[PDB]
Amino acid sequence: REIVHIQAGQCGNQIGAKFWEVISDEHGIDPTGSYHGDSDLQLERINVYYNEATGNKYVPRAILVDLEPGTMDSVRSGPFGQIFRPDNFVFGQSGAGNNWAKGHYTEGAELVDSVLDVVRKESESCDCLQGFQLTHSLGGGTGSGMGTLLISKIREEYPDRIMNTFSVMPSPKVSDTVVEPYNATLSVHQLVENTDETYCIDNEALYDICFRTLKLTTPTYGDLNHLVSATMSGVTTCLRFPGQLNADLRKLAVNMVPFPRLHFFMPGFAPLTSRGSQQYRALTVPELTQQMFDSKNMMAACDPRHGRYLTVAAIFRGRMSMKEVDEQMLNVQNKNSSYFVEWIPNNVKTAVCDIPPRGLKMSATFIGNSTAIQELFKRISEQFTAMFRRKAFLHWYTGEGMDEMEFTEAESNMNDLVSEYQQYQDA
């Protein structure tokens, strides 16, 4: 059961490099790709993300994509920069200029076939490929435009393979350019159709968390990425370690996605912690449960009380009473049953892994498929219309061959997605 990882653009590669930095530590792989741990549990399901080569040196099944070499050169000189297969560094020179059209139609189209050659090369080595995973932002050009172009072309060559993504949503609080709503709207259209799981990461939520909880007056992208990497590691725990849960990506997706278009998840994590700030007090199970269900710990700026949970998945890590876990989980549902749909029995499932992450003696990762996610898309839609009603900044796109009608369609499909979530919120 192998997974092929891809990371596109500036944001995608930086959280992606961070992901491989974190889980490489959990699996005891050093920057040079050599194993150095104590237990053997951290090698039973390591075939999922790593490739064995030249005398038990482990190489990530990762493909690093970008339309400019700036970010990928930083990755290569970074902490775990050496671990990555050098051939898997596929990059252009022109950049995308935070333009979805450049990444999806022109500049990216010129490079996409080169990436697929690496994807194809990795896939054919897998005994049984179970799916792909992508890390990118939706507010830029490459990770947004080319990222979705890759997904569309991956689905064409692998129409029966699971595609999950970790998608960073743009927000005016943490913004690079004003055309982010445009790029995001165009990308969501692509994600609604061609992915099985999308973990919606709002930079607004990551910002508010870093400021209002972690007590960081001015958070950087580095701070924001500590939160993401912790979540990325968490949701893949039970796939990376031997445990109770015998499930591939497909099976996992079947039990979380009641409707094909509604697969946009709210990720959460507890306890919330900043870089460097050392936690001494291990949380009790009641505290882990209460925190992972609190809005303040969600990483999409959406209030779960403004919607209902279609499905919920939780992963507790560390040494704890699995009985106490079941009791506390069953306590949340029975105390707030109005926030869970009644027409999907037992829609809250839990799993436990004995291995905790680095720095914490026990932690919990929250995956919620709430209808409250519509607030996220409604925000993008508002910011989108405000410019589009005046056709502002549109020349950047029409200069790359796009027509106004394609924007009108993308706008309609997301408003459809919003209305879809609203249908099941009132059932």
């Binding site: 569309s152 689905r155 064409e156 129409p159």
Partner: protein, 54 residues
Amino acid sequence: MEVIELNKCTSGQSFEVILKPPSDPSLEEIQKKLEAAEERRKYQEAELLKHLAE
């Protein structure tokens, strides 16, 4: 009350006690259903590759 059909052996014994008296599809049809469902997949997969072709 009434014990009957008492049978005994080295391994054990069995009996009956009464307290009160009273008062397929063919191999053809299967392979047809399976292959009819396969064509429904092929049609769905085709509409996808068609949609992606556009």
